[PDB]
Motif scaffolding. Sequence first.
Motif, PDB file in Angstrom:
ATOM      1  N   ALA D  20       0.827  -1.196   0.000  1.00 41.52           N
ATOM      2  CA  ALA D  20       0.000   0.000   0.000  1.00 41.52           C
ATOM      3  C   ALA D  20       0.867   1.255   0.000  1.00 41.52           C
ATOM      4  CB  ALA D  20      -0.934   0.008   1.209  1.00 41.52           C
ATOM      5  N   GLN D  21       0.253   2.373  -0.378  1.00 38.69           N
ATOM      6  CA  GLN D  21       0.891   3.680  -0.331  1.00 38.69           C
ATOM      7  C   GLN D  21       0.009   4.649   0.442  1.00 38.69           C
ATOM      8  OE1 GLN D  21       1.924   5.034  -4.260  1.00 38.69           O
ATOM      9  NE2 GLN D  21       3.107   3.191  -4.751  1.00 38.69           N
ATOM     10  N   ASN D  22       0.622   5.372   1.378  1.00 36.68           N
ATOM     11  CA  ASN D  22      -0.086   6.322   2.235  1.00 36.68           C
ATOM     12  C   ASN D  22      -1.246   5.659   2.971  1.00 36.68           C
ATOM     13  OD1 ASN D  22       1.696   8.078   1.042  1.00 36.68           O
ATOM     14  ND2 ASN D  22       0.145   9.273  -0.054  1.00 36.68           N
ATOM     15  N   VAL D  23      -1.052   4.413   3.403  1.00 37.42           N
ATOM     16  CA  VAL D  23      -2.104   3.724   4.139  1.00 37.42           C
ATOM     17  C   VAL D  23      -2.349   4.459   5.448  1.00 37.42           C
ATOM     18  CG1 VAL D  23      -0.337   2.109   4.915  1.00 37.42           C
ATOM     19  CG2 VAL D  23      -2.744   1.601   5.312  1.00 37.42           C
ATOM     20  N   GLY D  24      -3.611   4.799   5.701  1.00 37.01           N
ATOM     21  CA  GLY D  24      -3.967   5.631   6.832  1.00 37.01           C
ATOM     22  C   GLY D  24      -4.690   6.883   6.384  1.00 37.01           C
ATOM     23  N   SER D  25      -4.060   8.042   6.568  1.00 41.99           N
ATOM     24  CA  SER D  25      -4.613   9.317   6.138  1.00 41.99           C
ATOM     25  C   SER D  25      -3.649   9.986   5.170  1.00 41.99           C
ATOM     26  CB  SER D  25      -4.878  10.240   7.329  1.00 41.99           C
ATOM     27  OG  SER D  25      -5.478  11.451   6.907  1.00 41.99           O
ATOM     28  N   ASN D  26      -4.196  10.546   4.094  1.00 38.83           N
ATOM     29  CA  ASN D  26      -3.405  11.224   3.075  1.00 38.83           C
ATOM     30  C   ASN D  26      -4.040  12.569   2.763  1.00 38.83           C
ATOM     31  OD1 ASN D  26      -1.242  10.831   0.667  1.00 38.83           O
ATOM     32  ND2 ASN D  26      -3.084  11.856  -0.105  1.00 38.83           N
ATOM     33  N   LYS D  27      -3.214  13.616   2.741  1.00 30.08           N
ATOM     34  CA  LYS D  27      -3.660  14.955   2.385  1.00 30.08           C
ATOM     35  C   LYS D  27      -2.689  15.672   1.457  1.00 30.08           C
ATOM     36  CE  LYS D  27      -4.532  15.406   6.695  1.00 30.08           C
ATOM     37  NZ  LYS D  27      -4.777  15.873   8.086  1.00 30.08           N
TER      38      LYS D  27
ATOM     39  N   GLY E   8      -6.893  19.759  11.186  1.00 32.67           N
ATOM     40  CA  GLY E   8      -7.155  18.336  11.094  1.00 32.67           C
ATOM     41  C   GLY E   8      -6.729  17.596  12.349  1.00 32.67           C
ATOM     42  N   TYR E   9      -7.429  16.500  12.629  1.00 30.15           N
ATOM     43  CA  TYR E   9      -7.109  15.605  13.733  1.00 30.15           C
ATOM     44  C   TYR E   9      -7.031  14.181  13.202  1.00 30.15           C
ATOM     45  CZ  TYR E   9      -8.902  19.664  16.281  1.00 30.15           C
ATOM     46  OH  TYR E   9      -9.144  20.939  16.739  1.00 30.15           O
ATOM     47  N   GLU E  10      -6.112  13.390  13.753  1.00 29.86           N
ATOM     48  CA  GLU E  10      -5.902  12.028  13.286  1.00 29.86           C
ATOM     49  C   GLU E  10      -5.387  11.151  14.417  1.00 29.86           C
ATOM     50  OE1 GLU E  10      -3.293  12.069   9.937  1.00 29.86           O
ATOM     51  OE2 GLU E  10      -4.758  13.008   8.599  1.00 29.86           O
ATOM     52  N   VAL E  11      -5.867   9.910  14.451  1.00 28.80           N
ATOM     53  CA  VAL E  11      -5.366   8.878  15.351  1.00 28.80           C
ATOM     54  C   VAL E  11      -5.148   7.615  14.529  1.00 28.80           C
ATOM     55  CG1 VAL E  11      -5.704   7.655  17.528  1.00 28.80           C
ATOM     56  CG2 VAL E  11      -6.747   9.916  17.178  1.00 28.80           C
ATOM     57  N   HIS E  12      -3.976   7.002  14.681  1.00 22.72           N
ATOM     58  CA  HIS E  12      -3.565   5.875  13.852  1.00 22.72           C
ATOM     59  C   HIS E  12      -3.175   4.698  14.733  1.00 22.72           C
ATOM     60  CE1 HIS E  12      -3.370   8.555  10.304  1.00 22.72           C
ATOM     61  NE2 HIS E  12      -2.922   9.441  11.176  1.00 22.72           N
ATOM     62  N   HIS E  13      -3.691   3.514  14.397  1.00 21.38           N
ATOM     63  CA  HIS E  13      -3.385   2.282  15.118  1.00 21.38           C
ATOM     64  C   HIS E  13      -3.176   1.120  14.153  1.00 21.38           C
ATOM     65  CE1 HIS E  13      -4.454   3.885  19.187  1.00 21.38           C
ATOM     66  NE2 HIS E  13      -5.159   4.714  18.440  1.00 21.38           N
ATOM     67  N   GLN E  14      -2.417   1.343  13.083  1.00 20.30           N
ATOM     68  CA  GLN E  14      -2.210   0.301  12.083  1.00 20.30           C
ATOM     69  C   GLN E  14      -1.484  -0.892  12.692  1.00 20.30           C
ATOM     70  OE1 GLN E  14      -1.417   3.486  11.703  1.00 20.30           O
ATOM     71  NE2 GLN E  14      -2.985   4.148  10.239  1.00 20.30           N
ATOM     72  N   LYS E  15      -1.840  -2.088  12.223  1.00 20.27           N
ATOM     73  CA  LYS E  15      -1.215  -3.327  12.663  1.00 20.27           C
ATOM     74  C   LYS E  15      -0.930  -4.211  11.458  1.00 20.27           C
ATOM     75  CE  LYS E  15      -3.387  -3.467  17.236  1.00 20.27           C
ATOM     76  NZ  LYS E  15      -4.126  -4.322  18.204  1.00 20.27           N
ATOM     77  N   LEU E  16       0.213  -4.899  11.493  1.00 16.68           N
ATOM     78  CA  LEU E  16       0.576  -5.859  10.455  1.00 16.68           C
ATOM     79  C   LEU E  16       0.525  -5.218   9.070  1.00 16.68           C
ATOM     80  CD1 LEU E  16      -0.688  -7.380  12.979  1.00 16.68           C
ATOM     81  CD2 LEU E  16      -0.868  -9.350  11.447  1.00 16.68           C
ATOM     82  N   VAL E  17       1.378  -4.223   8.850  1.00 17.21           N
ATOM     83  CA  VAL E  17       1.477  -3.531   7.571  1.00 17.21           C
ATOM     84  C   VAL E  17       2.807  -3.900   6.929  1.00 17.21           C
ATOM     85  CG1 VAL E  17       1.425  -1.315   6.385  1.00 17.21           C
ATOM     86  CG2 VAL E  17       0.067  -1.647   8.458  1.00 17.21           C
ATOM     87  N   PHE E  18       2.756  -4.295   5.658  1.00 19.84           N
ATOM     88  CA  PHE E  18       3.926  -4.774   4.940  1.00 19.84           C
ATOM     89  C   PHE E  18       4.062  -4.031   3.620  1.00 19.84           C
ATOM     90  CE2 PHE E  18       4.521  -8.561   7.619  1.00 19.84           C
ATOM     91  CZ  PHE E  18       3.276  -8.636   8.209  1.00 19.84           C
ATOM     92  N   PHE E  19       5.302  -3.678   3.285  1.00 18.77           N
ATOM     93  CA  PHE E  19       5.637  -3.065   2.003  1.00 18.77           C
ATOM     94  C   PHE E  19       4.881  -1.759   1.777  1.00 18.77           C
ATOM     95  CE2 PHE E  19       5.609  -7.710   1.725  1.00 18.77           C
ATOM     96  CZ  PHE E  19       6.942  -7.964   1.475  1.00 18.77           C
ATOM     97  N   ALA E  20       4.582  -1.041   2.856  1.00 16.34           N
ATOM     98  CA  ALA E  20       3.809   0.187   2.760  1.00 16.34           C
ATOM     99  C   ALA E  20       4.732   1.398   2.659  1.00 16.34           C
ATOM    100  CB  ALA E  20       2.880   0.333   3.964  1.00 16.34           C
ATOM    101  N   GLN E  21       4.166   2.509   2.194  1.00 16.25           N
ATOM    102  CA  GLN E  21       4.863   3.786   2.136  1.00 16.25           C
ATOM    103  C   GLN E  21       4.028   4.852   2.830  1.00 16.25           C
ATOM    104  OE1 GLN E  21       5.943   4.773  -1.888  1.00 16.25           O
ATOM    105  NE2 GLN E  21       7.039   2.846  -2.229  1.00 16.25           N
TER     106      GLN E  21
END
Lengths: 32, 32, 32, 32, 32
Positions: D20-27, E8-21
């Motif tokens: 993935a790319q910019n997984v999460g929030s992107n602006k 803007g407001y953001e909260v991130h809790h990603q788990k098990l992320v592979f090959f991401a950017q």
Amino acid sequence: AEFRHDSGYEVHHQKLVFFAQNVGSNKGAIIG
Amino acid sequence: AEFRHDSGYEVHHQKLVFFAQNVGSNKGAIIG
Amino acid sequence: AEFRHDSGYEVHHQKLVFFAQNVGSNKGAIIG
Amino acid sequence: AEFRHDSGYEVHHQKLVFFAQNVGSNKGAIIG
Amino acid sequence: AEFRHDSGYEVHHQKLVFFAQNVGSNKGAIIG
């Protein structure tokens, strides 16, 4: 032309998505 | 022209989506 | 053209996403 | 063209995301 | 074209992320 939206709400639970773009919520410009 | 929407609600549970764009919710400009 | 959005809310719980771009929430420019 | 967004809120809990790319929030700008 | 976002407001809790950017939050330029 104008597009006015107020106080939107969204919940996303996508599963098994492949080759997608902006999967989830999109509100900005996306060009293929 | 104008498009006015207020207090929208959305729930998304897409499964097995391929080659899609903005899968889920879209409110911005998308160009193919 | 203009796109005006106010006080958006979003919750994301994507699972098993492959080859995606901006998976989650997107509000900026994305070019393929 | 313009894209105006105010006071956005986001919560992200992505799981098992691959390639993935910019997984999460992107602006910001993302180019493939 | 312009993209204007405020407070803007953001909260991130990603788990098990592979090959991401830029997994998490992205607001700058990213080129593949």
